Amino acid sequence: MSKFTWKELIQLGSPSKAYESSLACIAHIDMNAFFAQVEQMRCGLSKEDPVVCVQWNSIIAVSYAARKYGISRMDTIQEALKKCSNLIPIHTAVFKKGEDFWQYHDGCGSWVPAKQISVEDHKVSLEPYRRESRKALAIFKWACDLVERASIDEVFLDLGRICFNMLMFDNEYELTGDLKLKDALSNIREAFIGGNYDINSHLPLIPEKIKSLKFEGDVFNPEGRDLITDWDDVILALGSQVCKGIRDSIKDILGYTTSCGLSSTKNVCKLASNYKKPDAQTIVKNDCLLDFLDCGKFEITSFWTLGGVLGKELIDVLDLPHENSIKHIRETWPDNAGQLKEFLDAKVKQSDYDRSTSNIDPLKTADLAEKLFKLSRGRYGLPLSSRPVVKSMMSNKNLRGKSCNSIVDCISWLEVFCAELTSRIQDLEQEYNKIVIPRTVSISLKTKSYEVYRKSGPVAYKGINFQSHELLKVGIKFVTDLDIKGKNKSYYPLTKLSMTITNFDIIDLQ
DNA sequence: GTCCTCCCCTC
DNA sequence: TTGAGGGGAGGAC
Numbered sequence: 001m002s003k004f005t006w007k008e009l010i011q012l013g014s015p016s017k018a019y020e021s022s023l024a025c026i027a028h029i030d031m032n033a034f035f036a037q038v039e040q041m042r043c044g045l046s047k048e049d050p051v052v053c054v055q056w057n058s059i060i061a062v063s064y065a066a067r068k069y070g071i072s073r074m075d076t077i078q079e080a081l082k083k084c085s086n087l088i089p090i091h092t093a094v095f096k097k098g099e100d101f102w103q104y105h106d107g108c109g110s111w112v113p114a115k116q117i118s119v120e121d122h123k124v125s126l127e128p129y130r131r132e133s134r135k136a137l138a139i140f141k142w143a144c145d146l147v148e149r150a151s152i153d154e155v156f157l158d159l160g161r162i163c164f165n166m167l168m169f170d171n172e173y174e175l176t177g178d179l180k181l182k183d184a185l186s187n188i189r190e191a192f193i194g195g196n197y198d199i200n201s202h203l204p205l206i207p208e209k210i211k212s213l214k215f216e217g218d219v220f221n222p223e224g225r226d227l228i229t230d231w232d233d234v235i236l237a238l239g240s241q242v243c244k245g246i247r248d249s250i251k252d253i254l255g256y257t258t259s260c261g262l263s264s265t266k267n268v269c270k271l272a273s274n275y276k277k278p279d280a281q282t283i284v285k286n287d288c289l290l291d292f293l294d295c296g297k298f299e300i301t302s303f304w305t306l307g308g309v310l311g312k313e314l315i316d317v318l319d320l321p322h323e324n325s326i327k328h329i330r331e332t333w334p335d336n337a338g339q340l341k342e343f344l345d346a347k348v349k350q351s352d353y354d355r356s357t358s359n360i361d362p363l364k365t366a367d368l369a370e371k372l373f374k375l376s377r378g379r380y381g382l383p384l385s386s387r388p389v390v391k392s393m394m395s396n397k398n399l400r401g402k403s404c405n406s407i408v409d410c411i412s413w414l415e416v417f418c419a420e421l422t423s424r425i426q427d428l429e430q431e432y433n434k435i436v437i438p439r440t441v442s443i444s445l446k447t448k449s450y451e452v453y454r455k456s457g458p459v460a461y462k463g464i465n466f467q468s469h470e471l472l473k474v475g476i477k478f479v480t481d482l483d484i485k486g487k488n489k490s491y492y493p494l495t496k497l498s499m500t501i502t503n504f505d506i507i508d509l510q
Numbered sequence: 511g512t513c514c515t516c517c518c519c520t521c
Numbered sequence: 522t523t524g525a526g527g528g529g530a531g532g533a534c
């Protein structure tokens with residue numbers, strides 16, 4: 001019989017539990033060369049124009065046209081110009097200190113007179129990118145009932161309902177000119193409509209006729225395994241068809257190309273979306289999970305949450321090798337996560353451990369073992385969270401020279417931050433029909449000696465027309481407080497100043 | 511009980 | 522890098 005149960009299939013129809021099914025169909029979609037594509041589209045340029053988006057002197061995004069020249073993100077604009085004479089460098093929008101609005105200064109930059117965009121007198125605006133991100137999000141949410149915005153240019157989609165409904169109910173989809181999906185799937189549809197199945201019983205064996213169903217995109221398959229051999233493959237393939245449709249809506253409506261990863265889990269999807277770019281969809285079958293994870297590109301540190309100090313501690317505590325760490329984890333504790341838990345409990349129970357400088361929770365070693373056991377097999381299923389309209393907003397200026405050399409300069413930059421945040425808040429209120437209320441503000445700064453000073457606390461609310469004022473009041477309070485705390489110590493000129501609204505109330509309207 | 515400060519993760 | 526942003530522990534209040 002199938003490896004899968006009626007329970008696992010039917011749970012694809014539940015947004016709260018679909019992710020947990022071995023039959024899950026998740027997509028990760030990442031915008032290609034995002035900031036460069038935004039600038040390309042704003043300036044009416046083409047896929048063939050070698051655009052790079054520039055922030056001060058750094059390339060922050062490189063179009064795929066420009067990458068054909070050898071240009072890489074974080075190249076300096078100087079280096080980029082050597083590699084491509086026809087380069088189209090476009091600087092981010094900016095705010096000018098003393099003004100309360102952002103705009104593009106096209107024709108201006110550190111390349112190029114009276115046309116330089118100085119780091120002393122401006123701050124970056126990323127708002128054109130954020131706007132375009134929210135447009136994309138609207139398109140994704142219209143196509144799919146569960147979408148997680150993972151970062152400015154990434155989303156995850158849970159395709160469970162679309163796949164389930166297509167599998168059971170779609171009477172138009174054609175596999176071939178002589179074969180409809182409804183007829184290929186007559187046995188399973190009969191059983192489902194007949195309703196006479198046990199939720200804990202295994203599914204029938206896939207019908208031979210469903211093997212005509214095609215995947216849309218690149219199926220990762222170096223070992224040449226059979227494409228459709230169980231119901232997970234049927235769902236994944238249907239999912240790839242729908243995902244292509246969604247990605248085409250993004251391309252047709254907004255102009256943006258995407259790369260996409262399709263698999264049963266978020267973690268594998270995120271790896272897969274980065275496998276092939278631009279404008280591509282990489283599909284990882286369950287039976288190809290180990291082939292993919294072990295291709296040589298990935299280590300335990302490639303997994304989300306494991307890319308920093310915890311990951312490095314795990315390499316040391318689990319005596320992981322420098323390469324093929326994923327396979328190592330899998331083969332060293334091959335049967336169950338408890339084997340790994342036992343190993344962890346031993347290392348951590350030792351009196352010479354150091355529990356105050358470790359990122360492993362000794363009380364939660366069952367969860368860590370299960371996470372590593374499953375990640376190493378490509379079967380660690382995390383839920384998608386639908387995020388609120390906004391959670392936090394930051395306005396940040398890293399400062400050069402003496403552009404912030406006294407409390408007067410601090411406040412001058414705070415006025416830019418306050419104007420920016422207020423305009424961002426108004427835009428969200430109009431776009432999403434909400435009242436958006438800052439509740440808590442944090443000021444963070446760095447001295448000339450790079451020492452960090454922070455202060456957070458409540459901000460009062462008196463409506464949108466007084467919002468900038470209410471933010472500034474608290475900011476001025478906090479910067480003057482911190483000035484006192486820095487007396488007789490290395491302080492001015494500052495090397496960084498930022499204001500973040502760290503907590504919002506969101507009121508629904510209509 | 512919640513708040514503030516400090517910290518870790520990611521693009 | 523800079524300029525974002527997500528999240529949580531634990532002592533302060």
Ligand SMILES: Nc1ncnc2c1ncn2[C@H]1C[C@H](O)[C@@H](COP(=O)(O)OP(=O)(O)OP(=O)(O)O)O1
Nearest residue numbers: 030031032033034035036060061062152153277521
């Ligand atoms: N370290 C960073 N600092 C500031 N901005 C960044 C940084 N990394 C990425 N970005 C911005 C610019 C990118 O266009 C956007 C999305 O990031 P990312 O997906 O990593 O690259 P990308 O979309 O430019 O290229 P790709 O086609 O490889 O996805 O976020």
Ligand SMILES: [Mg+2]
Nearest residue numbers: 030031032033
């Ligand atoms: Mg991208």
Ligand SMILES: [Mg+2]
Nearest residue numbers: 030151154521
């Ligand atoms: Mg990204």
